[PDB]
């Protein structure tokens, strides 16, 4: 649809086409910079690099609050964020021994990080500082995922997902010339959006309906992984049968559906949906403190998408 | 000995004690910065972090050409270089499936890189640029190690070892206030030193004598790995028996000594020693273009150590 960009309906067509071109300049910049890499890199780098490009969208939408939403440096920031995102996927898939092998995945991701660093060097001192501080949080989060278990999970998703989208809002705001106050609100907005996005993803993966990309639920159950609704379910008074299923990876397709209908019917599925609604409210709050401009409506459509996709 | 620092004799005791304190301030800076990491990091980060600290020594020795050899930023540069070095070891040991496991090794190294980035953000734009460009070369080199085979090996060791020691000389020169010309010569010196260091290491690992750390030779033969003297040996007209041994990993301890006495007696061991002597001459050339100061004698003792250790 002429109003939709990267999976969210932004309203007016002249606005959606402005944002679309912004995301396209991020895309072009990343392809240009990645294609300069030595031949020995090509196979590794381009493998995990199209996309949904949520982070570039967030960066470009954040910049629409500023008086220069199409600043050259907004595109550079967009490319930096997306490259760090892509890089984390490579490194996760090694330590998980994961499908999305581990041959040369450490070095490729390591490149996406060098390259990210190359581009952020163009944005100046504070940007290099912002990104350094962010990547550092991002690691600690994946790290802590590696080990109050509920407090711990929420610290994980704030570090591993929240931080980087926080940085996208901060850099989008800064490089578009937004006020100091607007920069802080887009940063806070980004941190919450990233947190709600991960929790929504975790609920969706238990819900009986198929995901955005048409995927069936149960992956997290199968991989052993403990998500918010499971963490809540485990500490209730039946909850014993759940405990045994969830104790590790589940490979029997009936134990999968067994574990599912056990999770779905748990008070845990209620506690987790409540947590999501609290982060969604926190996001909508930060939105209400932005000016009443088409940029704000677009960011509200993005929150709406985040907490229902 | 009162004249020795990090395995090389620098001559005068007042000079060696100045350089020793410089390397100690790099050490202290790295420990301070690494100990601030979130608890979940500690186990991973401190595991691969004492040392021989060749890169900090090179950085501090390079700074002794400048009129401010003890500049605050020389210590920051020293810590940046050593952290990137340590980080590459973590990532190599995963893709090699290596002893020096791979559990959380991707993320730790990833931290050492975030932290490196945090410190280099203190040195300003061009430093962030230098390091970004360097890490990028460093990857391509490990990468190319992953695939004229001889030309290719030498490109590998220039990228994977040469680049970073090149950066150490460049940053040591810059932050000590050395001239533009002196900075370029310390950079070139560093690139060659790193190249000779790796080739010397590869020869030492075949020589019948034990290494610096008392290690017996043959590891590279055992791990399958092809080094300069093997690459030369393979393309001679006996050379057929060598080809079969070297075809992959060697686990039989007699085939190890068989492969050894075959490598030692090869014209390949002559071609490789000649390559080393050419890089040693290139290093000594760059040294002759530096001023006649105690810094130059110390760097000459370092080259002497590099090409015989």
Integer distance in angstroms from the first to the last C-alpha of chain A? Answer: 18
Q: At which residue do the structure tokens 């990210």 appear? A: A116
Structure letter (DSSP) for residue A207: S
Closest CA to B269 of B203, B198, B195: B203
Q: Would you give the DSSP letter of residue A215?
A: P
B132-149 as b/e, with b when 16 or more CB fall inside 10 Å? Answer: bbbbbbbbbbbbbbbeee
HSE, CB side, 13 Å, CA atoms: give it for residue B283. 29
Whole-number Å distance between alpha carbons of B268 and B225: 15
CB-CB under 8 Å, A136 with B114: yes
Residues in chain A: 309
Is B118 within 8 Å of A133 when comparing Cβ atoms?
Answer: yes
Instruction: Give yes or no for B118 touching A (CB within 8 A).
Output: yes
Contact A120 B135 (CB under 8 A): no
Instruction: Give the DSSP letter string of chain B.
Output: -TTEETTEE-SSHHHHHHHHHHHHHHHHHHHHHHHTS-HHHHHHHHHH-----HHHHHHHHHHTTSS-TT-HHHHHHHHHHHHHHHHHHHHHHHHTT-----TTHHHHHHHHHHHHHHHHHTT-HHHHHHHHHHHHHHHHHHHHHT--HHHHHHHHHIIIIIHHHHHHHHHHHHHTT--HHHHHHHHHHHHHHHHHHHHHHHHHTTSSS--TT-PPS-HHHHH----HHHHHHHT---HHHHHHHHTS---SHHHHHHHHHHHHTSHHHHHHHHHHHHHHHHHHHHHHTS-SSHHHHHHHHHHHHHHH-
Could you give the C-alpha distances from A170 to A66, A162, A181, in angstroms and in order? Answer: 11, 12, 11
Chain B residues touching A111 at Cβ < 8 A? 136, 139-140, 143
Name the DSSP letter for residue A5.
Answer: E
- Contact A136/B at CB under 8 A: yes
**Contact present, B236 and B267 (Cβ < 8 Å):** yes
- Distance between CA A131 and CA A144 in Å, rounded? 20
d(CA B63, CA B22): 10
| Alpha-carbon gap, residue B188 to A105, rounded angstroms | 31
What is the spatial distance between Cα A191 and Cα B195, in angstroms, rounded to a whole number? 45
DSSP string computed for B161-181: IIHHHHHHHHHHHHHTT--HH
Residues of A in contact with B109 (CB under 8 A): 106
CB-nearest partner of A106 from B91, B114, B133: B91
| Burial label, A115 (beta-carbon count in 10 A; 0-12, 13-18, 19+) | buried
Determined by which method? Answer: X-ray
Annotated binding site of B for Mg(2+): 92, 96
Contact at 8 Å (CB) between B22 and B10? no
| A159 contacts A138 by C-beta, under 8 angstroms | yes
DSSP state of A90: H
- C-alpha span between B118 and A138 (Å, rounded): 14
Can you tell me the distance from the alpha carbon of A168 to that of A54, in angstroms, rounded to the nearest whole number?
Answer: 10
State whether residue A9 is helix, strand or coil: strand
Token pair belonging to A181: 């106050």
As given in the structure block, the two tokens for residue B261 are 């006495």
Query: What distance in Å separates the CA atoms of residue B237 and residue A120, rounded to the nearest whole number?
Result: 52
The dihedral formed by the CA atoms of A195, A197, A203 and A204, expressed in degrees to the nearest 10: -170
Indicate the annotated binding residues of B. Answer: 52, 55, 85, 92, 96
Measured CA to CA in angstroms, residue A97 lies from A38, A70, A107, B10, B103 at distances of: 27, 40, 16, 48, 9
Taking the C-alpha atoms of residue A160 and residue B175, their distance in angstroms, rounded to an integer, is 35
The residue length of chain B stands at 309
CB contact at 8 A, B55 and B166? no
- First and final CA of chain B: distance in angstroms? 18
Report how far residue B79's alpha carbon sits from residue B76's, in angstroms, rounded to the nearest whole number: 5
* 3-state class percentages of chain A: helix first, strand second, coil last, to nearest 5: 75, 0, 25
Q: Print the domain residue range for B297.
A: 4-308
* Whole-angstrom distance, CA of residue A152 vs CA of residue A159: 11
Torsion angles phi and psi, residue A5, rounded to 5? -140, 130
Residue of A38, A90, A31, A83 whose CA lies nearest to B145: A38
Residue of B nearest to A128 (CA): B121
Q: Which of residues 270-299 of A touch B (CB under 8 A)?
A: none
- Min Cα separation A104/chain B (Å): 6
Q: Choose the mutation target among A34, A36, A39, A40 for the interface with B, i.e. most B CBs under 10 Å.
A: A40
The helix (run of H) or strand (run of E) holding residue A8 is strand A8-9
Angle at A71 between CA A66 and CA A73, to 5 degrees: 110
Are the C-beta atoms of A132 and B117 separated by less than 8 Å? Answer: yes
Decide: residue B72, CB within 10 A, 0-12 exposed, 13-18 middle, 19+ buried.
Answer: exposed
Question: DSSP of B264-294, one letter per residue?
Answer: HTSHHHHHHHHHHHHHHHHHHHHHHTS-SSH
CATH number for the domain harbouring residue A139: 1.10.600.10
As for how many domains chain B has, the answer is: 1
Beta bridge partners of B4: B9
Q: Which tokens go with A11?
A: 């309203």
- To the nearest 10°, report the CA torsion of B96, A42, A86, A176: 140
Nearest CA in chain B to A160: B107
Give kind and range of the element (H or E) at residue A37.
none
Strand-pair partners of B8: B5
What is the three-class DSSP state of A292? coil
């Amino acid at each position: 649809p002429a109003t939709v960009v990267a999976g969210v309906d932004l309203g007016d067509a002249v606005f959606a086409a402005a944002v679309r071109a912004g995301v396209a300049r991020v895309e072009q910049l990343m392809d240009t910079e990645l294609r300069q890499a030595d031949e020995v890199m090509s196979d590794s780098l381009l493998h995990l690099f199209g996309g949904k490009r949520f982070r570039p969208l967030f960066t470009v939408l954040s910049a629409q609050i500023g008086p220069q939403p199409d600043a050259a440096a907004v595109t550079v920031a967009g490319a930096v964020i997306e490259m760090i995102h892509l890089a984390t996927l490579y490194h996760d898939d090694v330590m998980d021994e994961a499908v999305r092998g581990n041959n040369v995945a450490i070095l490729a991701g390591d490149y996406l990080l060098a390259t990210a660093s190359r581009l952020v060097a163009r944005l100046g001192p504070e940007a290099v500082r912002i990104i350094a501080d962010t990547f550092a949080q991002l690691v600690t989060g994946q790290m802590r995922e590696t080990r109050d278990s509920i407090e711990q999970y929420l610290k994980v998703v704030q570090e591993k997902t929240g931080s980087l989208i926080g940085a996208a809002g901060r850099l989008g705001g800064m490089f578009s010339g937004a006020t100091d106050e607007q920069v802080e609100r887009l940063s806070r907005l980004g941190g919450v959006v990233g947190t709600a996005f991960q929790i929504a993803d975790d609920i969706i993966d238990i819900d009986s309906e198929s995901d955005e990309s048409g995927k069936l639920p149960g992956t997290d159950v199968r991989e052993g992984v403990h998500t918010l609704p499971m963490l809540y379910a485990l500490r209730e008074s039946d909850c014993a049968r759940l405990r045994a299923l969830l104790n590790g990876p589940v490979d029997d397709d009936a134990e999968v559906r067994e574990a599912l209908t056990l999770l779905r019917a748990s008070p845990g599925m209620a506690r987790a949906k409540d947590v999501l609604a609290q982060y969604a409210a926190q996001a909508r709050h930060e939105l209400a403190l932005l000016p009443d401009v088409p940029g704000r409506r677009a960011l509200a459509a993005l929150v709406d998408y985040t907490v229902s996709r």
